[PDB]
Each structure stands twice: as C-alpha cells, then as structure tokens.
Curated annotation (Swiss-Prot), chain A:
Pfam families assigned: Baculo_ODV-E27 (PF05314)
Keyword Membrane belongs to the record: yes
GO BP: symbiont-mediated perturbation of host cell cycle progression
Family recorded in the similarity comment: Belongs to the baculoviridae E27 family.
Subunit structure: Interacts with host mus209/PCNA, cdc2 and cdk6. Forms a complex with proteins C42 and p78/83.
Primary localization class, coarse: virion
Organism whose genome encodes this protein: Autographa californica nuclear polyhedrosis virus (AcMNPV)
Protein name as catalogued: Occlusion-derived virus envelope protein E27
Gene that this sequence comes from: E27
Transmembrane segments: none
Keywords for this protein: Host-virus interaction, Membrane, Modulation of host cell cycle by viral cyclin-like protein, Modulation of host cell cycle by virus, Viral envelope protein, Virion
Membrane among keywords: yes
UniProtKB/Swiss-Prot annotation, chains C, D:
Subcellular location: Host nucleus; Virion
GO cellular component entries: host cell nucleus; virion component
Keywords: Host nucleus, Late protein, Virion
Name of the protein in its database record: Protein C42
From-to range in the entire protein, with total length: 113 to 334 of 361
Keyword set includes NAD: no
Oligomer status and interactors: Forms a complex with proteins E27 and p78/83. The interaction with p78/83 mediates nuclear translocation of P78/83. Interacts with protein Ac102. Interacts with IE0.
Length: 254, 218, 212, 212, 42
C-alpha cells in the first residue's frame, strides 16, 4: 500500500506530491517488536538443535563432553556447530571446509586461558583444538534459573478473562553456540587474513570490528552475541588499575 | 582444638566495645565472624548471641526476658568490657550489629545485560497511552538548567546582512523548500510511530495543518 | 542453639558463589559469612573445611597439611554440601575468595573483585600462546574429517513451542556469565594476567558490529 | 490512687483510634498513652492486653504465646472495653500501632503515619489482582439477575426533613475516612504496598471531573 | 510478675535526671510511660 502527501503554498494553486510506500514503515515496526527478535534468536537456536538431532546428537551436550573415551562425538559436534555458524554467515555453502583435523585437550598444561576452541595450520591441513575440561566446566556450572531479568497488565486482563528440553539444556546449547561463534570469528580472520593476523587477533580482539564490518556487516545476518549489550559489573572501578592520560585519534572501537 | 579461644575473645571485646560505646576505628568482616564465634562458643554468652543473631532478618524474635535474665545479660556484657551500662547500651549495640550484619560483602563481577533497542511489545498502543508512559519515563530524567545572558529577545536589524541573505536565498523556490520540510517532518513522525508500535491517526496529522484555511477564510 | 537448616542453606549459597560453581547473583551480606562459618564449625564432618577457611584470617598462615585421604574426604564433604566436577582447584578458589572476603573491611557497598591468587610462573597471554601452543601441536589429532540443515517446519514449530516459555534474556545472561567465569578461572589458574580490556572490547566489538 | 473512670475513658478513646475502629480525630497526647497503659496495668482482666502492649517496647520481643481460651478472653476484654467485628486482626493493628507509638521519640508536633507491619509474602497490587482474581472466578455466583425509581414528592419531602438537620460535611467526612481506613487495613493485612499516589489521584480525578 | 521492676527503675532515674537537672539527650514516649509506671508502682 502507498500513501500520498500534498503540499500547497499560499502563492498559487501549485501542489507538489510525494508517494510513500508503507512496506518500509511496516518493516521498521516489525523490527521494533521484541517478540520478533526473540523469535529470530529462538528460531536460530531451534535450527541448531534440529541440526544436532538429525546427526543423532540428541544426548545432552554436557553428557557428550563428559565422555572422555568417545572423541568422535565431540569432534562431530564442534564441526557441526562451526558449519552451522558458517552457513549463518554465508547462506550458500552447506558443507564446511572439506578437510580438517581435531585434537582434544584434557590438560591445563596445554590449555589456552580464554579460547577453548583454537585453530592452527600444521603445514598440511587445518587443525582444531578442543579444550574438553573447559567446555565441561562451562556446561556443568549451575545456572540462575529462578531469577527474573528486567507485561503485568496483559496478564491481569487474561486472568480476568516431544523431546524434553529443559531450560538448562537450552542454556547449554546457547553457551556452546556462542563459544563456537567466537572461535569462528577467530577462524574467519585466520582464513581470510593469514596466520599473522590470527595470532594478532588472539591477543587483541579489537581488530574484529575492522576485519568484520568491511564484509560481514553488509552481507550476512546479525551475530548471536549482538542480541544483548553485555557489560562487566563495576568495570570502571576494576579497570582503574590501568588508566591512561590518553589522546585517542584512532578510536576505531567506541 | 579447633578454636583459638583467647584471640577470638580479645577480638570480640574490641568489636563489642567499639559498637556498644564508641558509636563514632575500623574493623574487618573477619572480626565480626570472630565475635559471633566467641559468643556462640562461650556458654554464658548464649543469650547475647541469640539477641544479636535476631538481627539477621526481620522475622526473628526473642521471648520476654525476666528480671534475673536481664541482670545475667548485663553482668555478662560488663565482664566483656567495669564501666556502668544498662539495657539502653544493649539496644544501641544491637542496632549497630544490625547495621553491620546487613552490610554487603565482596562479590565477583558478573556480566550485566542491557537492552540494545527499546523493543516494543506486540499489542499496539494509542498516542495517549504512549504519551503517559513516555512522560512517566521523562519524569525520571535529570533536567538541566539553562541561563540566558539577558531577557531581551534575540534579533538582528543589520540591513546589509538581511538583504544579502535574502538575495542568496532568492533563487530558492518556496514550494520546494516547504515541501521538503513538511515531508521530512512527516517521514520522521511516521518512522517514530512505526518504531514505537503506535497507531498513526491520519486525521489528526491533517488537522495539524488546517491553519492554512483558517487564515484564508477569516 | 542455632538453626542447622538456615545456616546450611546460607553456607551452600555463599560457597556456591565463592567457588564459581554458579552464576546466581544474590547480594550477600556479612550475616551469610557469619552463618557459613558457624555452620562449618558446628558440623563435625566440615571441621576440615572450617579450619581451612579460618586459617585465611592471617595472610602469613597458609593451608594446613592434609594427607591424601583427608583431601579426598574434604572433597566429598564439599560435594555433599553442594549436592552436585569438584576438585582441588575448586578448594583453592574457595580459599582465595574467603581470604579476600575476611581481610576486607566492613563497608556499606558490595566490593566487586576478580579472581586472583590461586595456583610461581607469572606469565602473560602471548608466552602462554607460544608455549602451550606447541604442547598442542605435539599431540596428534584423534579424528579426521574429509551437512544436513533440515528446515522441517513442523519440527521447528515443536522446538519453538518447547523453547518459547524460556526467558531468552536469562539464557543469554547464564551463557555469558558462564563463559566469563570459565575464562577468568582459566586465567587465574594459569597464573596469567586477565586483561578485562580485551574481554570488554569483545562486547564492544559485538555492539559496533550490530549497528552496521 | 488513680481515677479509674478517667483513665478508662482515655484508654477507650486511644484504643478506638489505634484499632482503626473509629474515625473520631482527636489530638492525642502522651498523657493519654500514660493513662491507657496505667489503666491496662491496674485492671485485673486487662492484664493480658497490658502485657501484650508492653512487649512492644523492644522490637526483638514479639507477641506472648496465648492458648485459644486466652485469646478468646482477651477478645472479650477488648470488646467490653470498646462496648461495640473485633477479632485477631484488630489486636494485630493495636499491637503495631502501640509499638510504633512507643518507639517514637517525644516530639512537639503529631506524627502522621500509615498502617504497616501487620499480618511473609510481600506483594504488590497486580499480583494480588491476578491471584485473588481467579480465586474469585473459582467461586460460583449465588444470584442471577435477568426498576422503580419513585419520585413521590411527599415521601421525598419527609425524607429530606429527616435528613435536613444532618451536617452533610460530617457525613462525607465519615464516609471518606471509613473508605480510606478500610482500604488501608485491607492493604496492610494483605501485605500489599498501599500506593497513596493512586488514592490521592482518585480525589484529584474527582476535582478535575467537577470543573468540566 | 507483670512489671520488670529494675529496668523500669533505671528508665525512670534517667528520665527524671534529664528533666529535673539537664533542662538542655532525647527520649521516647515509652520511657515516659515507664517512668510513670515506676512512680505509681513504688
């Protein structure tokens, strides 16, 4: 549907006319609905769960990662998550990198503090590192499942008028999805800008904004971690140890 | 032996002397735990321990103390400190301990979630309810004071500048300028209405600009 | 006489937070510390834990010597208290947390801290990257890979129906805090400086990514 | 020796106000409190009430344990003192009122307060709306309805003659204060926050309604 | 026993010492009732 507007000035009978197409306003309104974005995120998570299900991966993720002996399931789960994220970024390639190897880490002695899934080149083939105890500690941590994070009127008006997926399981799925999303961002910088840039990014995540917004911000969908604005409680007080009398002329990351 | 009795005892003496009398130095949480441990472990201070523990929440009480009980509490607390005291000292120390036990302790940092975009709910809202809600939200904001240099209305009577601006904007049609201004106003209004999930009343927006005919007819 | 149940519950919650085994963010007061210490003292089979946490009052007095059977028994005691894995590093986290809580002064507003003083080799992120780096390549991979993305409308509808009552914001909060706590614990255990500038810049990157 | 009659009258009036059983607004002084407490102590059959109100001196000492016969006898004593229904919630209102009066400091101007601290579940208006809401629909209605407005001039004249000597302002004051006190007591008993903004906005609505 | 005699007594001592001599800290209404009860009972 189209809406027409007419402007008339008091010096003549001239009328200048413009046509507005309502679809743009409808799209903005739909993008402003909380239920719409919630449905988008939940549909992404549901597609992830369905993708795991068709790969027999019905067992809870914590149970999958708790099995030390069976490495094939862990490798398949991580590879499938990487492929799902890759398809989300590029909705044209259904198969991930056709050949890559997996190594599972069970020791702190060879563990990376903060990047549980890491990628490296052995001069012959891609290799992916999986820190199994880190993922186990992530998924096994007790979750806050009774607290409320900030409509009562619609509830009042209403009052006057089969796979068993618990909340813990869904939170575990989302946790693994976000972790593999971080790993995939690192891997994307790797594959597209070299090992040097990948190891530069491992120590400074601020290069993501420059090496993603050039291509991803205008071609792919929205990232899962962008659904909410995350901040550290009392960040300024803790950061007060490292304060600079700064002069920022290349503040490329607000 | 699990309890270093004497060091606990002096810690409790110091803390209770500070809270009861010196209501005006500083102590750590460890000393508070120490004082409570001493009060619990010492047999003759059980009544005082219960009285101070009643300050943990607002749904705890104490049975009415008979006379001999209040004298026992009093000389026990005096043995804690020779200075003469009474039940009022017990009351002020209890209030100080109540303030202390409600003091928050250290906690690790947590990731706090902030709403990215003020996403509206499914049900459409009219202009009036939206106005009420947004006015309530604005009420919570902190206004800023603006002080003008003087009371006189700003103006300019420089002829040369006035005819010069007029000449510069002379080749600029009024029709196109007014059309652009009205259309950008309308587009911004409609965009805000769509984002706010508010119903747009076309008749009201049309009634906005009827001063044209009001002037022309009268 | 004290209420064993209330003190046990307060101890359970405070230890859950102080062990980084839970993301439940409940404002803890001095009363909870008093209750947890009193319960630890009173319960016979938590005497080892009570002595362990009480030794933290003085920074110069460090952890008591425990033979392997004693450490195993204390681990079982902690597991029973939490009814949940739990190992020695959890006990180290608890010791450090309680030491910092005890040595902290009484104050009106909750003090926000980060995990520190757990587990000689004070390193940074890059040396760990290199070092552990090879220790990785040293290991041979286990699996060789050399993809169905079904859009079954009914199946996704049922999945959405199951997921619909879940408060997405709570799930995101739980996942983000879990990742943050795991990263912080790995940093502290590895004796590597945790640069919260980088971690916050991750979120800043996401925020800057969205608006383009 | 004290005058039993004067002390009894002062106690009656002060308890009438402090039980919210009367709208009579008479400025009460400390002397009335002294008289009511002394009379409560002296009278043998008001000893239970005197002890009950005296326990309110310390906030940590709560209500004495009374067996059912004792509670019934105290209820009869309160009824006799007021010669008026009266039940346990009236005693709770009286206890809270006297506790707040006693713990209040001596001051030159009367302190205006609202009823609070009577009757675990701290709720708000909307949750109560929903909750009690159904508990309502749960009940089946008793009566089914599926109208004379006579203007008999002589009858209305006689009714006006009967009503004419009544000071309309006093009737309005009594009705409004009665509604306010019933609403406040229902809010406090239900442990729901009484939002006096809304109640005052009711009057503001009436005022704005009239002038249009 | 209905009257906690000694606590009442010290309350009355404090209140009467405050009113009689220190005409210039602060007390609650409860202390006034307490003092009158002590004066009547003694």
């Amino acid at each position: 549907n189209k809406v027409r507007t007419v402007t008339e000035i008091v010096n003549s009978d001239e009328k200048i006319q413009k046509t507005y197409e309502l679809a743009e306003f409808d799209l903005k309104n739909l993008s402003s609905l909380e239920s719409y974005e919630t449905l988008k995120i939940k549909l992404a998570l549901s597609k992830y769960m369905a993708m795991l299900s068709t790969l027999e991966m019905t067992q809870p993720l914590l149970e999958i990662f708790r099995n030390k002996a069976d490495t094939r399931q862990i490798a398949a789960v991580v590879f499938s998550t990487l492929a799902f994220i890759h398809n989300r970024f590029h909705p044209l390639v259904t198969n991930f990198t056709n050949k890559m190897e997996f190594v599972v880490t069970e020791t702190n002695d060879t563990s990376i503090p903060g990047e549980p899934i890491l990628f490296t080149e052995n001069e012959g083939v891609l290799l992916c590192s999986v820190d199994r105890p880190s993922i186990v500690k992530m998924l096994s941590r007790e979750f806050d499942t009774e607290a409320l994070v900030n409509n009562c009127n619609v509830r009042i008006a209403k009052t006057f008028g089969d796979f068993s997926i618990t909340e813990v399981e869904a939170t575990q799925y989302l946790t693994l999805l976000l972790t593999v999303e971080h790993a995939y961002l690192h891997y994307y910088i790797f594959k597209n800008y070299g090992v040097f840039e990948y190891c530069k990014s491992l120590t400074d995540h601020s290069l993501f904004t420059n090496k993603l917004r050039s291509t991803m911000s205008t071609k792919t969908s929205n990232l899962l971690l962008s659904k909410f604005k995350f901040t550290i409680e009392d960040f300024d007080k803790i950061n007060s140890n490292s304060v600079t009398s700064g002069f920022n002329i290349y503040n490329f990351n607000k | 032996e699990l309890i270093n009795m004497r060091r606990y005892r002096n810690a409790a003496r110091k803390l209770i002397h500070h809270y009861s009398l010196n209501s005006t130095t500083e102590y750590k949480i460890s000393d508070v735990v120490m004082t409570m441990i001493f009060l619990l472990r010492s047999e003759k201070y059980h009544s005082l321990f219960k009285l101070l523990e009643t300050t943990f929440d607002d749904y705890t009480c104490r049975p009415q103390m008979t006379q001999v009980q209040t004298d026992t509490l009093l000389d026990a607390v005096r043995s804690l400190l020779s200075t003469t005291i009474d039940l009022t000292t017990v009351d002020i120390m209890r209030s100080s301990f109540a303030r202390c036990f409600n003091s928050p302790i250290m906690r690790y940092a947590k990731i706090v979630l902030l709403q990215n975009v003020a996403l509206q709910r499914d049900k459409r809202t009219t202009l009036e309810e939206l106005l009420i809600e947004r006015g309530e939200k604005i009420q919570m904001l902190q206004p800023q004071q603006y002080i003008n240099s003087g009371t006189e209305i700003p103006f300019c009577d420089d002829a040369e500048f006035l005819n010069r601006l007029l000449k510069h904007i002379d080749p600029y049609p009024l029709s196109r300028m007014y059309y652009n201004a009205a259309n950008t106003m309308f587009y911004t209004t409609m965009e805000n209405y769509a984002v706010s999930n508010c119903k747009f009343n076309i008749e009201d927006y049309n009634n906005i600009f009827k001063v044209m005919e009001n002037i022309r007819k009268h």
